[PDB]
Structures are given as C-alpha cells and as structure tokens.
Design a protein around this ligand. Structure first.
Ligand code: HEM
Ligand code: CM9
Length: 421
C-alpha cells in the first residue's frame, strides 16, 4: 500500500530538484495536498513528512531505537571527516566572552557605516563559538580566513548528497578544499605552539600512542564541535536584527527595556542569563518565522502507524519546523510578526508543545538552546546599546538561500549603522 505522494517530482531525481530550489514550498504542498502524513521523493529515497501536533508528537517522542537520527545524516561525513561547555556554571563566563567578541568585531565601526549581515554575523559567530567551546587562546589565533573556509564547508551540503556525497560538482570540490584549508590552519597553529609556548588544543596535542592525534583528526573534532551552533546562531542573529528593523515599534520597546535593565549597573554576563522579556519575545517570534533548521530527518528502525499510515523499516521520516511553526490553527495569523504571542497571557510557544519547534521537542530537543538564547541576549545587549541600525535595501529583499541543506542568509543583506547618542 503506497503512502500519499505530493504532486510534481517528475524531474530526474523526483522531488530533489524542487527540494534544492524551494524546499519550504515543497513541504507546504505536501501538507496542503495530503495533510499530516505525506511523502516526497529524494532521488532513490522516499521521505515521509510528518506535520501537525499528533504526527509531530510521534516524531519527537521516538527514541533512537525507533527513529534513528544519526543514520539520517551520512552526508556529514565529508565535513566532519559539547556538554562540557554548555554547563550552566560556565554560562556566565561565556556571556562575558561573547560580549568581548562583539566589542572586538565593532571596534572599527566608528560613527557610521554599512555592513552585510551574513559577512558580519557569520564571522562573529565563528569567534564566539571557538572562544566559548575551544578556548580564548585558540580563538585568538584565528582570523577571517577561518570563517571564510568554515562557510565553504557549510556550503558543501547540496541535497545532491542524497544521491552521493562524493559527486564531481563544484560545491563538493570546494567543500573538500575548504576542509583541507582548515586542517592547514590548524597545523600552522600547532606548529606555532611548539616553537613558542592551556586549552583543549593543548590537551589533544599532549595525547600519545608519538603524538596520538594528527592535525586532520584535531580539525575534525573542532569542526564537529562548532557545527551545530554556528550557522544556526549566525542566521538567528541576522534575522533578529532584520525583524527589529522591520518592526520599529518592537525595536523601540527592546531599546527602552535594555536601557532600563542595564541601569542597575550589572554586566552583560549578569543580564544575558536573566529575563530580557521584549528581546526574548522578539527572538521567539524570529525563530518561529525563520527556523534555521527547516527539516529534521530520521531513519525508521521499525514498523509504525501514524493516522492509519504505515511507516516501514528504513523509511526516511521528517518533521518540519518551517511548516509546523506556521500552522494557522495553532498560531493565529501565522505569517505575521507578533512577539505578543509569547507574553504571559498567551504563551503560544508553551501551549503548542509539538508544533512550536524551532528547537525541536521531546527526546532530541536542542541542548544548545540555553546557550543560543544567552548568546543572542549578549550580542544585542551590546549592539543595540552602542549603535542604531537601518535597512539599506528594501525590507522584503532580505531572504534566505535554500540551495543547500544548511540554510544561510542570502546576500546582499546590507544594513546601515550609526552610533547612538
Ligand atoms: C538558534 C540556534 C539553534 C537552533 C535553532 C537549533 C535547533 C535545533 C533543533 C531543531 C534540534 C532538534 C533536532 C532533531 O530533532 O533532529 C536541535 C537539537 C540539538 N542541538 Fe540545536 N539548535 C541551535 C543551537 C545549538 C547549539 C549552539 C548547539 C551546541 C552548542 C546545539 C546542539 C544540539 C544538539 C547536540 C541537539 C541534539 C539533542 C539530542 O539529540 O538529545 N544546537 N537543535
Ligand atoms: C542537513 S544539513 C546539516 C545540518 C546539521 N546536522 C548535523 O550537524 C548533525 C549530523 C548528525 C547528528 C547525529 C545530528 C545532526 C546541523 O547543523 N544540525 C544541527 C544544528 C543545531 N542543532 C542541532 C542540529
């Protein structure tokens, strides 16, 4: 018995080509035509796309014995080749680290100027991530080259990886070359440390077996440590700023709140760990509209039924924060930016436990969420108190690029700044 299948997908790799150009439109059509359980074809693989509270509950409550997350991502192998840092006791230090990295990034801004949001936030979040997760010593040996290479690595996630992660296409060539470039950067750092003498890199260097670990092995470890939090935090920062500029009433409310809160004289390392309500509600609404992970994958390990539909062993099964986060029965006026949705009387995030899912839900809910929310609070506590921001292009022209499985803000994303006075 065939599962319901969405229209189209008559191209050579079925729906893959559409998934490479407009994955959100594809997923919305699955739901529009078929409901809570529908399928599309990615080359040789059927994807069973689940949506709505009932089907999402099944998806998110499944453990790795039923729905296996790791086997759904074999294409990350050419890229790769956290808990320690996410302990609550370390958060205060991380907030201070992040404040420091932001001030470093804006140190040359002067009175006024123009930035590109992807270039700015992508680079900044390389610095916050490396400093927090590997160490300040290591971060201080990084520069813009590392960020440029890391970005090429992220761009190595074209959905054609579902055909074969090793095809001779330019983005895969560039992925492999970028990884090579990172190993070289890391090798040069290790070499410098020999000649001129602690962090995680020192622990690893000291291991023996003759050194146990090569630059390639170490680079892989560091790439994997930084990956989950990099493009997600970068994009979320960009979109938080874009939504504030698009909604000047929300922006004004956030500024008033930051000024009042910081009037107690306590640092960002204090406040970024505590309530900043208007900014937090803007962040929640930003995540609902612009979830950086638009689809979540699993491989079925068994036979299941969901609303009469049978999932078979080996099936790819997916959930979509992009689609679920806009279900109109759950989120009134789902295309509208309404941070009031999260205020205490409404609490639409908390009420919709299985469909407000920018950070997932149940068994695999984001363990980086507290860090990521603190990081946004720390970044904007600095930026919005020091500078005022305006769009340098039409407000509707800021958009994501969905050509790779790793979503990124499309360029250009030009923004003006001017010192607040
Ligand atoms: C705004 C930033 C972030 C967003 C939007 C986000 C999103 C998500 C989502 C949707 C899931 C569920 C995945 C699934 O069910 O397949 C998840 C899980 C997870 N995230 Fe994040 N993430 C963010 C930042 C981070 C950071 C900074 C880290 C690490 C420092 C991280 C590490 C993880 C890990 C390890 C899981 C798996 C949890 C488990 O399997 O128990 N994420 N995240
Ligand atoms: C489909 S493009 C790759 C997306 C990427 N996924 C990954 O890095 C992981 C690979 C295998 C793991 C078991 C789980 C997911 C990622 O950035 N995931 C992520 C980010 C933030 N939190 C959780 C997962």
């Amino acid at each position: 018995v065939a599962l319901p299948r969405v229209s189209g997908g008559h191209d050579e790799h079925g729906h893959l080509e559409e998934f490479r150009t407009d994955p959100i439109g594809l997923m919305q059509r699955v739901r529009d035509e078929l409901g809570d359980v529908g399928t599309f074809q990615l080359a040789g693989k059927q994807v069973v796309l689940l949506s709505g509270s009932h089907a999402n509950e099944f998806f998110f409550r499944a453990g790795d014995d039923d729905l296996d997350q790791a086997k759904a991502y074999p294409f990350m192998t050419p890229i790769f080749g956290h808990n320690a840092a996410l302990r609550g006791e370390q958060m205060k230090g991380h907030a201070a680290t992040i404040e420091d990295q932001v001030r470093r990034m804006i140190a040359d801004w002067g009175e006024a100027g123009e930035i590109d949001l992807l270039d700015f936030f992508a680079e900044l979040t390389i610095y916050t991530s490396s400093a927090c997760l590997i160490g300040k010593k290591f971060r201080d040996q990084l520069d813009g080259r590392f960020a440029k290479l890391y970005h090429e690595l992220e761009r190595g996630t074209d959905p054609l990886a579902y055909v074969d992660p090793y095809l001779p296409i330019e983005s895969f060539r560039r992925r492999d070359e970028a990884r090579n470039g990172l190993v070289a950067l890391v090798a040069d750092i290790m070499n410098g440390r020999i000649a001129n003498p602690r962090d995680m890199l020192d622990v690893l260097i000291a291991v023996k077996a003759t050194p146990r670990f090569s630059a390639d092995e170490i680079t892989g470890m560091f790439i994997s440590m930084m990956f989950a939090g990099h493009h997600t935090s970068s994009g979320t920062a960009s979109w938080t700023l874009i939504e504030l500029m698009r909604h000047r009433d929300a922006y004004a409310a956030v500024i008033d709140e930051l000024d009042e809160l910081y009037g107690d004289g306590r640092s960002v390392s204090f406040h970024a760990l505590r309530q900043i309500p208007q900014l937090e509600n803007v962040l929640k609404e930003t995540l609902r509209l612009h979830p950086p992970l638009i689809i979540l994958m699993r491989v079925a390990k068994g036979e299941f039924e969901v609303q009469g539909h049978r999932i078979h062993e080996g099936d790819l099964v997916a959930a979509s924060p992009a689609i679920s986060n806009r279900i109109p029965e759950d989120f009134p006026d789902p295309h509208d930016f309404v941070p009031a949705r999260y205020e205490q009387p409404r609490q639409e995030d908390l009420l919709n436990r299985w469909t407000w899912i920018p950070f997932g839900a149940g068994r695999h809910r984001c363990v980086g969420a507290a860090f990521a929310i603190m990081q946004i609070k720390a970044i904007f506590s600095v930026l919005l108190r020091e500078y005022e921001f305006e769009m340098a292009q039409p407000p509707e022209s800021y958009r994501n690029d969905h050509s790779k499985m790793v979503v990124q803000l499309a360029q250009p994303a030009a923004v003006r700044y001017r010192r607040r006075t």
